[PDB]
Amino acid sequence: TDCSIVSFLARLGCSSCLDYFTTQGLTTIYQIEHYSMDDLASLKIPEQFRHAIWKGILDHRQLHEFS
């Protein structure tokens, strides 16, 4: 299912990154479900968080496919 980016990041310990999404009008996981690492870099997400967030996004993709 879709979910808020607030909820999604909280599960990954990446809540400090919320504003990078919200300032761009990004509020749901479906909006960012196909974001790559390059895309997260474009949002200016600090490097310490990027791989963790991206791996979370990939997991959501996979759960979505096999749901």
Side-chain angles (χ1 to χ4, degrees):
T1 65
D2 203 356
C3 74
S4 67
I5 290 173
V6 176
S7 295
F8 170 74
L9 290 176
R11 292 189 297 260
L12 312 177
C14 291
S15 294
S16 289
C17 289
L18 182 62
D19 291 356
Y20 298 97
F21 293 94
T22 57
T23 56
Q24 304 297 302
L26 304 163
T27 62
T28 73
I29 221 304
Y30 274 9
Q31 288 173 310
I32 61 168
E33 211 174 23
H34 291 293
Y35 273 36
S36 66
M37 294 269 252
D38 281 344
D39 296 328
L40 299 173
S42 90
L43 293 181
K44 305 307 184 191
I45 296 285
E47 271 267 57
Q48 65 263 32
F49 295 105
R50 287 184 205 162
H51 192 269
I53 292 176
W54 177 77
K55 189 59 179 171
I57 291 171
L58 183 54
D59 283 338
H60 204 274
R61 277 182 217 163
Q62 297 173 352
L63 286 162
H64 200 163
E65 181 191 356
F66 303 84
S67 71

XYZ file of all heavy atoms in Angstrom:
544
model
N 0.815 -1.209 0.000
C 0.000 0.000 0.000
C 0.855 1.268 0.000
O 2.041 1.237 0.334
C -0.930 0.052 1.232
O -0.147 0.166 2.430
C -1.796 -1.190 1.314
N 0.230 2.381 -0.367
C 0.827 3.699 -0.243
C 0.930 4.023 1.251
O 0.239 3.427 2.082
C -0.061 4.747 -0.950
C 0.696 5.982 -1.363
O 1.903 6.088 -1.045
O 0.088 6.867 -2.005
N 1.811 4.951 1.586
C 1.960 5.403 2.961
C 2.647 6.753 2.959
O 3.220 7.174 1.947
C 2.750 4.382 3.787
S 4.542 4.345 3.454
N 2.617 7.455 4.084
C 3.264 8.756 4.105
C 4.768 8.612 4.179
O 5.298 7.643 4.742
C 2.780 9.616 5.275
O 3.196 9.072 6.514
N 5.459 9.587 3.609
C 6.914 9.617 3.728
C 7.323 9.766 5.199
O 8.359 9.214 5.609
C 7.524 10.719 2.828
C 7.368 10.313 1.359
C 8.994 10.950 3.156
C 7.782 11.414 0.402
N 6.522 10.474 5.997
C 6.749 10.542 7.453
C 6.849 9.138 8.050
O 7.821 8.782 8.718
C 5.634 11.309 8.184
C 5.854 11.256 9.697
C 5.581 12.752 7.703
N 5.859 8.307 7.774
C 5.843 6.952 8.305
C 6.980 6.086 7.773
O 7.599 5.326 8.515
C 4.481 6.305 8.014
O 3.454 6.997 8.716
N 7.238 6.218 6.474
C 8.262 5.467 5.781
C 9.652 5.748 6.352
O 10.395 4.818 6.656
C 8.183 5.831 4.296
C 9.330 5.318 3.476
C 9.426 3.974 3.155
C 10.278 6.189 2.981
C 10.483 3.517 2.380
C 11.335 5.727 2.198
C 11.428 4.395 1.902
N 9.986 7.025 6.516
C 11.318 7.391 6.984
C 11.515 6.978 8.430
O 12.617 6.586 8.826
C 11.556 8.898 6.837
C 11.690 9.439 5.403
C 11.836 10.960 5.408
C 12.829 8.794 4.607
N 10.448 7.057 9.208
C 10.514 6.747 10.621
C 10.915 5.282 10.810
O 11.678 4.951 11.727
C 9.168 7.053 11.286
N 10.437 4.418 9.920
C 10.770 3.004 9.981
C 12.237 2.741 9.666
O 12.759 1.668 9.979
C 9.873 2.183 9.037
C 8.421 2.130 9.472
C 7.592 1.140 8.641
N 7.497 1.494 7.228
C 6.455 2.107 6.656
N 5.399 2.480 7.365
N 6.481 2.361 5.353
N 12.887 3.695 9.000
C 14.278 3.522 8.598
C 15.252 4.297 9.479
O 16.454 4.216 9.277
C 14.486 3.953 7.140
C 13.502 3.427 6.094
C 13.832 4.032 4.726
C 13.610 1.918 6.036
N 14.733 5.044 10.445
C 15.584 5.875 11.283
C 16.109 7.086 10.532
O 17.123 7.677 10.907
N 15.374 7.492 9.502
C 15.790 8.594 8.641
C 14.835 9.792 8.711
O 14.735 10.568 7.760
C 15.895 8.095 7.180
S 17.228 6.976 6.898
N 14.149 9.955 9.843
C 13.155 11.030 9.977
C 13.749 12.428 9.796
O 13.057 13.361 9.368
C 12.410 10.930 11.316
O 11.597 9.757 11.385
N 15.038 12.579 10.083
C 15.690 13.876 9.898
C 15.730 14.345 8.436
O 16.006 15.519 8.152
C 17.102 13.851 10.491
O 17.007 13.819 11.904
N 15.446 13.433 7.509
C 15.430 13.756 6.090
C 14.074 14.209 5.551
O 13.960 14.520 4.370
C 15.912 12.557 5.270
S 17.652 12.282 5.478
N 13.058 14.267 6.403
C 11.717 14.551 5.918
C 11.636 15.802 5.058
O 11.050 15.766 3.979
C 10.717 14.674 7.069
C 9.252 14.922 6.696
C 8.654 13.786 5.870
C 8.479 15.070 7.974
N 12.211 16.901 5.545
C 12.026 18.192 4.894
C 12.548 18.219 3.459
O 12.054 18.967 2.619
C 12.654 19.319 5.724
C 11.908 19.579 7.031
O 10.852 18.954 7.282
O 12.383 20.423 7.816
N 13.547 17.401 3.166
C 14.047 17.336 1.802
C 12.978 16.874 0.834
O 13.016 17.204 -0.341
C 15.248 16.406 1.728
C 16.398 16.884 2.565
C 16.600 16.394 3.836
C 17.302 17.819 2.066
C 17.670 16.825 4.609
C 18.371 18.256 2.828
C 18.552 17.758 4.094
O 19.613 18.195 4.855
N 12.031 16.084 1.332
C 10.944 15.595 0.500
C 9.811 16.602 0.516
O 9.317 16.988 -0.528
C 10.436 14.240 1.001
C 11.432 13.146 0.838
C 12.294 12.815 1.878
C 11.526 12.447 -0.357
C 13.210 11.812 1.728
C 12.464 11.432 -0.511
C 13.293 11.117 0.528
N 9.406 17.025 1.708
C 8.202 17.834 1.826
C 8.365 19.178 1.111
O 7.428 19.665 0.475
C 7.780 17.983 3.285
O 8.840 18.541 4.048
C 7.440 16.641 3.874
N 9.549 19.773 1.183
C 9.735 21.049 0.488
C 9.534 20.947 -1.024
O 9.280 21.962 -1.690
C 11.085 21.710 0.811
O 12.165 20.806 0.518
C 11.118 22.124 2.273
N 9.630 19.729 -1.561
C 9.401 19.458 -2.982
C 7.992 18.951 -3.292
O 7.721 18.480 -4.395
C 10.401 18.412 -3.480
C 11.839 18.796 -3.251
C 12.214 20.042 -4.006
O 12.094 20.097 -5.228
N 12.665 21.057 -3.283
N 7.098 19.026 -2.322
C 5.750 18.536 -2.532
C 5.618 17.027 -2.501
O 4.583 16.483 -2.903
N 6.675 16.351 -2.035
C 6.689 14.894 -1.925
C 6.271 14.471 -0.522
O 6.934 14.796 0.475
C 8.085 14.329 -2.245
C 8.683 14.701 -3.606
C 10.161 14.436 -3.624
C 7.973 13.939 -4.722
N 5.156 13.771 -0.451
C 4.575 13.401 0.834
C 4.200 11.933 0.917
O 3.877 11.444 2.000
C 3.295 14.213 1.137
O 2.304 13.926 0.139
C 3.577 15.708 1.188
N 4.183 11.223 -0.212
C 3.841 9.803 -0.159
C 4.919 8.918 -0.757
O 5.711 9.346 -1.618
C 2.517 9.469 -0.881
O 2.730 9.543 -2.300
C 1.394 10.427 -0.465
N 4.937 7.673 -0.303
C 5.892 6.677 -0.818
C 5.643 6.383 -2.302
O 6.587 6.136 -3.044
C 5.865 5.378 0.031
C 7.272 4.806 0.283
C 4.858 4.352 -0.523
C 8.100 4.528 -0.947
N 4.388 6.430 -2.748
C 4.103 6.164 -4.167
C 4.750 7.213 -5.059
O 5.181 6.920 -6.188
C 2.585 6.127 -4.443
C 1.917 4.788 -4.214
C 2.592 3.736 -3.616
C 0.582 4.591 -4.576
C 1.979 2.530 -3.398
C -0.041 3.384 -4.361
C 0.662 2.358 -3.768
O 0.045 1.147 -3.549
N 4.822 8.445 -4.572
C 5.475 9.511 -5.318
C 6.961 9.237 -5.558
O 7.501 9.584 -6.612
C 5.303 10.852 -4.621
C 3.878 11.401 -4.717
C 3.726 12.631 -3.885
O 4.089 12.638 -2.717
N 3.199 13.696 -4.482
N 7.618 8.593 -4.601
C 9.065 8.419 -4.690
C 9.475 6.972 -4.921
O 10.674 6.630 -4.834
C 9.784 8.959 -3.424
C 9.333 8.201 -2.171
C 9.533 10.453 -3.271
C 10.240 8.496 -0.940
N 8.503 6.121 -5.244
C 8.756 4.687 -5.279
C 9.793 4.275 -6.315
O 10.410 3.235 -6.168
C 7.464 3.882 -5.480
C 7.536 2.516 -4.804
C 6.237 1.749 -4.857
O 5.417 2.040 -5.754
O 6.043 0.859 -3.996
N 9.992 5.085 -7.342
C 10.969 4.736 -8.372
C 12.205 5.633 -8.341
O 13.018 5.632 -9.281
C 10.316 4.736 -9.758
C 9.341 3.618 -9.969
N 9.724 2.294 -10.022
C 8.000 3.628 -10.160
C 8.661 1.536 -10.221
N 7.601 2.321 -10.310
N 12.384 6.372 -7.246
C 13.566 7.214 -7.110
C 14.831 6.369 -7.003
O 14.863 5.379 -6.279
C 13.472 8.130 -5.886
C 12.757 9.442 -6.145
C 11.680 9.493 -7.003
C 13.178 10.623 -5.544
C 11.015 10.688 -7.252
C 12.515 11.821 -5.781
C 11.439 11.840 -6.638
O 10.775 13.024 -6.901
N 15.857 6.785 -7.730
C 17.171 6.161 -7.634
C 18.016 6.938 -6.632
O 17.602 7.967 -6.103
C 17.856 6.213 -8.992
O 18.118 7.563 -9.338
N 19.222 6.445 -6.396
C 20.175 7.175 -5.577
C 20.505 8.538 -6.150
O 20.645 9.507 -5.408
C 21.422 6.346 -5.409
C 21.062 5.165 -4.639
S 21.306 5.555 -2.942
C 22.716 4.466 -2.991
N 20.644 8.605 -7.472
C 20.849 9.883 -8.151
C 19.706 10.847 -7.846
O 19.941 12.038 -7.609
C 20.979 9.676 -9.665
C 22.361 9.197 -10.072
O 23.303 9.315 -9.258
O 22.501 8.697 -11.203
N 18.468 10.341 -7.835
C 17.315 11.194 -7.551
C 17.371 11.730 -6.133
O 17.060 12.896 -5.892
C 15.988 10.460 -7.761
C 15.774 10.052 -9.202
O 16.247 10.778 -10.098
O 15.141 9.014 -9.445
N 17.760 10.876 -5.191
C 17.872 11.326 -3.814
C 18.975 12.373 -3.679
O 18.851 13.293 -2.888
C 18.105 10.153 -2.858
C 16.988 9.109 -2.836
C 17.414 7.908 -1.994
C 15.681 9.701 -2.312
N 20.044 12.230 -4.463
C 21.124 13.215 -4.447
C 20.583 14.552 -4.953
O 20.952 15.617 -4.462
C 22.307 12.739 -5.294
N 19.681 14.485 -5.923
C 19.117 15.694 -6.506
C 18.244 16.445 -5.498
O 18.085 17.661 -5.590
C 18.307 15.351 -7.755
O 16.957 15.099 -7.421
N 17.676 15.718 -4.539
C 16.923 16.330 -3.445
C 17.845 16.897 -2.374
O 17.383 17.493 -1.403
C 15.993 15.299 -2.786
C 14.822 14.760 -3.599
C 13.998 13.772 -2.760
C 13.936 15.915 -4.072
N 19.141 16.675 -2.542
C 20.155 17.140 -1.605
C 20.114 16.398 -0.270
O 20.521 16.937 0.754
C 20.066 18.656 -1.395
C 20.139 19.476 -2.688
C 21.355 19.116 -3.526
C 21.467 20.002 -4.775
N 22.486 19.498 -5.748
N 19.619 15.159 -0.293
C 19.662 14.291 0.878
C 21.109 14.021 1.258
O 21.901 13.569 0.419
C 18.942 12.952 0.597
C 17.458 13.200 0.328
C 19.081 12.001 1.776
C 16.692 13.514 1.564
N 21.480 14.321 2.514
C 22.877 14.101 2.919
C 23.313 12.667 2.674
O 22.520 11.741 2.840
C 22.859 14.403 4.419
C 21.749 15.368 4.592
C 20.694 14.977 3.569
N 24.573 12.483 2.299
C 25.083 11.172 1.911
C 24.899 10.089 2.967
O 24.661 8.928 2.636
C 26.561 11.275 1.544
C 26.817 11.599 0.086
C 27.009 10.359 -0.768
O 26.110 9.489 -0.792
O 28.071 10.248 -1.417
N 25.017 10.463 4.233
C 24.882 9.508 5.321
C 23.525 8.790 5.326
O 23.387 7.709 5.910
C 25.148 10.176 6.681
C 24.169 11.252 7.104
C 24.671 12.641 6.778
O 25.381 12.840 5.789
N 24.306 13.610 7.609
N 22.537 9.379 4.659
C 21.175 8.827 4.669
C 20.764 8.184 3.357
O 19.798 7.407 3.321
C 20.142 9.925 4.912
C 20.222 10.589 6.258
C 20.750 11.861 6.365
C 19.697 9.979 7.394
C 20.800 12.506 7.580
C 19.748 10.623 8.624
C 20.294 11.889 8.711
N 21.439 8.543 2.271
C 20.922 8.219 0.942
C 20.760 6.734 0.697
O 19.715 6.301 0.199
C 21.802 8.811 -0.158
C 21.697 10.276 -0.316
C 22.539 10.697 -1.509
N 22.951 12.082 -1.391
C 23.951 12.615 -2.076
N 24.649 11.863 -2.920
N 24.252 13.890 -1.914
N 21.786 5.951 1.005
C 21.688 4.518 0.737
C 20.610 3.865 1.616
O 19.839 3.016 1.157
C 23.048 3.800 0.851
C 23.012 2.409 0.295
N 22.704 1.306 1.065
C 23.138 1.959 -0.972
C 22.705 0.227 0.303
N 22.968 0.594 -0.937
N 20.530 4.271 2.878
C 19.490 3.729 3.751
C 18.082 4.004 3.210
O 17.215 3.141 3.246
C 19.629 4.284 5.152
N 17.848 5.218 2.736
C 16.533 5.583 2.235
C 16.268 4.811 0.958
O 15.185 4.254 0.789
C 16.418 7.111 2.005
C 16.454 7.832 3.357
C 15.165 7.441 1.222
C 16.448 9.378 3.224
N 17.259 4.767 0.076
C 17.083 4.077 -1.195
C 16.792 2.578 -1.011
O 15.900 2.027 -1.669
C 18.297 4.310 -2.110
C 18.135 3.551 -3.379
C 17.334 3.879 -4.433
C 18.714 2.284 -3.686
N 17.395 2.889 -5.397
C 18.238 1.901 -4.959
C 19.595 1.437 -3.011
C 18.611 0.715 -5.567
C 19.966 0.261 -3.612
C 19.481 -0.091 -4.888
N 17.562 1.913 -0.148
C 17.276 0.514 0.180
C 15.842 0.340 0.721
O 15.170 -0.644 0.398
C 18.319 -0.039 1.159
C 18.231 -1.550 1.385
C 18.400 -2.320 0.069
C 18.333 -3.830 0.316
N 18.270 -4.615 -0.957
N 15.364 1.302 1.504
C 13.991 1.273 1.962
C 13.023 1.391 0.799
O 11.990 0.710 0.775
N 13.349 2.257 -0.160
C 12.487 2.429 -1.325
C 12.437 1.142 -2.148
O 11.362 0.704 -2.579
C 12.960 3.596 -2.206
C 12.741 4.916 -1.472
C 12.252 3.596 -3.564
C 13.372 6.096 -2.188
N 13.600 0.539 -2.360
C 13.668 -0.721 -3.092
C 12.863 -1.816 -2.386
O 12.167 -2.588 -3.030
C 15.121 -1.151 -3.307
C 15.366 -2.412 -4.122
C 14.663 -2.303 -5.449
C 16.867 -2.601 -4.334
N 12.947 -1.880 -1.067
C 12.163 -2.879 -0.329
C 10.669 -2.661 -0.544
O 9.915 -3.623 -0.733
C 12.456 -2.814 1.165
C 13.762 -3.443 1.536
O 14.269 -4.285 0.770
O 14.285 -3.110 2.621
N 10.228 -1.401 -0.488
C 8.825 -1.096 -0.775
C 8.403 -1.541 -2.177
O 7.327 -2.126 -2.335
C 8.527 0.395 -0.572
C 7.080 0.695 -0.295
N 6.156 0.871 -1.297
C 6.409 0.869 0.873
C 4.972 1.130 -0.764
N 5.101 1.140 0.552
N 9.240 -1.264 -3.182
C 9.007 -1.763 -4.547
C 8.793 -3.269 -4.583
O 7.858 -3.754 -5.220
C 10.206 -1.502 -5.440
C 10.292 -0.153 -6.054
C 11.541 -0.102 -6.964
N 12.132 1.212 -6.845
C 13.365 1.536 -7.217
N 14.162 0.636 -7.782
N 13.792 2.781 -7.043
N 9.692 -4.000 -3.933
C 9.642 -5.465 -3.920
C 8.443 -6.028 -3.183
O 7.815 -6.982 -3.642
C 10.939 -6.039 -3.360
C 12.132 -5.685 -4.223
C 13.450 -6.095 -3.620
O 13.517 -6.522 -2.474
N 14.520 -5.965 -4.399
N 8.141 -5.467 -2.025
C 6.937 -5.864 -1.321
C 5.722 -5.601 -2.190
O 4.760 -6.367 -2.179
C 6.816 -5.098 -0.010
C 7.766 -5.554 1.091
C 7.919 -4.499 2.190
C 7.284 -6.888 1.668
N 5.769 -4.506 -2.944
C 4.640 -4.098 -3.774
C 4.408 -5.094 -4.895
O 3.264 -5.417 -5.224
C 4.894 -2.722 -4.384
C 3.651 -2.025 -4.848
N 3.610 -0.671 -5.111
C 2.401 -2.491 -5.081
C 2.391 -0.336 -5.497
N 1.637 -1.420 -5.482
N 5.498 -5.574 -5.487
C 5.404 -6.517 -6.596
C 4.886 -7.888 -6.162
O 4.104 -8.519 -6.877
C 6.758 -6.687 -7.283
C 6.702 -7.645 -8.463
C 8.067 -8.016 -8.987
O 9.069 -7.463 -8.480
O 8.138 -8.865 -9.905
N 5.323 -8.344 -4.991
C 4.981 -9.681 -4.524
C 3.856 -9.682 -3.504
O 3.689 -10.653 -2.762
C 6.224 -10.381 -3.964
C 7.342 -10.472 -4.949
C 8.216 -9.411 -5.120
C 7.494 -11.599 -5.742
C 9.238 -9.478 -6.038
C 8.517 -11.672 -6.669
C 9.389 -10.610 -6.818
N 3.089 -8.595 -3.473
C 1.970 -8.458 -2.545
C 0.722 -9.132 -3.102
O 0.665 -9.468 -4.288
C 1.688 -6.976 -2.244
O 1.116 -6.315 -3.365
